[PDB]
Amino acid sequence: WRKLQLSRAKLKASSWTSALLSGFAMVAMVEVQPGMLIAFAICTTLLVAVHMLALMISTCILPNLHWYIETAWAFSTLLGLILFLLEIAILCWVKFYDLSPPAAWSATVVLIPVMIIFMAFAIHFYRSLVSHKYEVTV
Amino acid sequence: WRKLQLSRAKLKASSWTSALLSGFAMVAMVEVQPGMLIAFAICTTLLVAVHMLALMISTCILPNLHWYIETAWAFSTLLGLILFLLEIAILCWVKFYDLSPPAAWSATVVLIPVMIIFMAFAIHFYRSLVSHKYEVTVSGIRELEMLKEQME
Amino acid sequence: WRKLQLSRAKLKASSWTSALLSGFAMVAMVEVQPGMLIAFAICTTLLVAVHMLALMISTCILPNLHWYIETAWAFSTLLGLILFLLEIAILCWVKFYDLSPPAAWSATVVLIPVMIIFMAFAIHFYRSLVSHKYEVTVSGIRELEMLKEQME
Amino acid sequence: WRKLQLSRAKLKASSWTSALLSGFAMVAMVEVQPGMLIAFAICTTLLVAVHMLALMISTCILPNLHWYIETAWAFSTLLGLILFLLEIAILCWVKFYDLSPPAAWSATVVLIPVMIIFMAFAIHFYRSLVSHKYEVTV
Amino acid sequence: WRKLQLSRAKLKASSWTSALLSGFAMVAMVEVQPGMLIAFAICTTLLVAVHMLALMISTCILPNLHWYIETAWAFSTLLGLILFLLEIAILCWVKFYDLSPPAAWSATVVLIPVMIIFMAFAIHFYRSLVSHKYEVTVSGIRELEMLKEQME
Amino acid sequence: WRKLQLSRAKLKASSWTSALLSGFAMVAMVEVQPGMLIAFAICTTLLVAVHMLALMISTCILPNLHWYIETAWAFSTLLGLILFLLEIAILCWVKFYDLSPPAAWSATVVLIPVMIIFMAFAIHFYRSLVSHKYEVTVSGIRELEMLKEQME
């Protein structure tokens, strides 16, 4: 029971953001329509693609290894999550590099602190977890 | 009970994305408003149409073969899913081919890697499934025969 | 219980799409702002109107024939569903007919295939259903007669 | 129990549409930005206002006559519902009366059939209901 | 149980509108981009701010006086509710005062009727409530005294 | 049970706003497209980033210290909440600073009041809470001692 609730809630939660954030970003890109443009195209294309994985995983998990797909799901979500933040930075870039280049720097500069803590917080949480799997084993 | 929850949650989940992704894409296309344009019109028209199937399936499943429609539903969703990803690529194309054509190439190029793994991951998951339907069939019939043999 | 869940889930599901797809389409039309324009105005006006029916039905079903309104609801949803798909096609038309008319044809042409299978898939599913209502009816009277025969 | 579910589901359902349709219409009006303009301003202002009633009713019903507010709620929703349809028609009007006036006529003309069946379907359903309240009484 | 459902449903309901209406209004303002402009900036800034309160209250209520915060929540929601309606009026103003000033008057004029009934309906409902808290206090204390008198 | 509901409801509630408010703000910024611009880029970049934390926390909490992450979650949400309100102000600024600078001042000026009460209301609620944790602690040891005294 406690295992079924953790799946049902998570299922809706994942589909929720993926579709929203993805669809939102797509609309954002086309809305604003030198070198950074090479990233804007890739950063966006990856976002939609990454989230799709999570969504397609939301379709395959219902019928059905559980600890394997569970990872593909979480990893996909996280990958897409960081990307969305990566997206906003690129936007400030292009959205400002035409009329106000000076302010744009702060956007990419302010991204650095947060991007680090993000991937960092994920590590600490994971490390403490592996320690438990071993602790319980002994 | 475990079967009813898997349906209720799935039902809302499917309707959720279909309506959102579809409606979102439609707004995206009209928002930006050479040859690629032939695809942008088709790629989008299919997306809305494909998702609609899933939605219309969300309406017919409630009243009511179950393993048949279940496929039409999943297949539709998956088809629409890949399309959305196909959509974003086409957008980078048109959204850039005017001012910055050079970067656009990466978008369609970076799509290839992901599009493959997508349709590929769907195959591996499906294959492992069919193997189980057969596995259960053999073990199941065997156990039964064992009982049939002793009955005699 | 199984009947209450099928209603609660369906209720939210219907309201969900209707409001989303409807509101989305409305925003789409005004966003882009020869003969096809006569359809764009009608196709859209119907979409909002059709979905509204389903929504207003979501309000009247809670208090309260059940197989009658159930049809008005499903029919409305389906009508609005096909319309949304009809909408996207009209959009490619107007969204391209200004700068790129040539590609637009594929959109309406590609729509035909899918639109057919859509209304077609709905028929096959419905037909198989009616066959069951009859099948169960015959089986039902038979079981009863079996009991009536032994009673004697 | 069957009474609590009918309230919880209805509650979310009402809030759902009201906020969505209302917010959507508002965005629609400002997006496009002779005589019909007098209606576009009134038709929209009423929509947001009407739905708000339903929303504010979604806040007061939780604490707490039940058949009275139940009416204000349903009536508000229905009023806002018809208005949204009324809105789309007005949009085709203004959205076309600049470049393509000819097609606009169909929008308002096609609205008539549906608007009638709408208010009509509401009557038939209500009439059959009153007949039951009397039937049960006898 | 009946108290937990009233909280869970209300929680989602509040977060729902606040985020939607707020985010929607913000997008509306920037979308259209003499004296009324002084209000458009304030009316909007308050809306987002007011709803935020309700949202932040949706975060603090889960852990945890109950009749106090319950008021801050309801009051915030209501304040934001009326504001949204106040917003639409201001929009007709700015959205029209450029090309069609004449029609705009009706928008602000038609707002007056509804804005009054809104704050008015809130009063009647609240008044009837306070009357009950007092009513229960008297009947409740009376029943108790009746028992206290007999005890002696 | 009462602990599982408080988590499930909160989970959806958090994901809800984060994705909505974040995505909405992003669309708002690009939609409008002197010194304040330095803030608009930073204020927005932080919003998306902050909310992401809450979202990523919505993914890690399901598997699994509870009072620690619970804080990172609430703190993140609150940080993002205030930012959204900070965002609207910056918008009035840029959205008006071009054509109508005079009215913009009120937006940032009107923000001060509300921003204060916001962070202030959060403090009062928290303070009253800590007082209870201590109150219960004293009462708890007292009840126990009462039993310890009688035991003797």
Residue numbers in the entry:
A (entry chain B), D (entry chain B): 148 to 180, 189 to 219, 240 to 313
B (entry chain C), C (entry chain A), E (entry chain C), F (entry chain A): 148 to 180, 189 to 219, 240 to 327
Paper text:
Orai was identified as the protein that forms the channel’s pore and STIM was identified as its regulator. The channel is activated by the depletion of Ca2+ from the endoplasmic reticulum (ER), and as such it was characterized as the calcium release-activated calcium (CRAC) channel responsible for store-operated calcium entry (SOCE) before the molecular components were known. The channel is formed from an assembly of six Orai subunits that surround a single ion pore, which is perpendicular to the plasma membrane in a cellular setting. Each Orai subunit contains four transmembrane helices (M1-M4) and a cytosolic M4-ext helix.
We also obtained crystals of K163W Oraicryst in a P42212 crystal form that diffracted X-rays to 4.35 Å resolution, which assisted with model building and was indistinguishable from the I41 structures of WT and K163W Oraicryst. The K163W mutation corresponds to R91W in human Orai1, which is a loss of function mutation that causes a severe combined immune deficiency-like disorder. The structures of WT and K163W Oraicryst reveal an ‘unlatched-closed’ conformation of the channel that resembles a hybrid of the quiescent and open conformations: the ion pores are closed as in the quiescent conformation but the M4/M4-ext regions have conformations like those observed in the H206A Oraicryst structure. The K163W mutation has no other apparent effect, and this is analogous to observations from structures of the quiescent conformation with and without the K163W mutation. Congruently, we observe that the corresponding K163W mutant of Drosophila Orai can adopt an unlatched conformation with a closed pore. Our observation that the unlatching of M4b from M3 does not necessarily open the pore is consistent with studies indicating that STIM1 can bind to loss-of-function mutants of human Orai1 that have constitutively closed pores, such as the pore-lining R91W mutant.
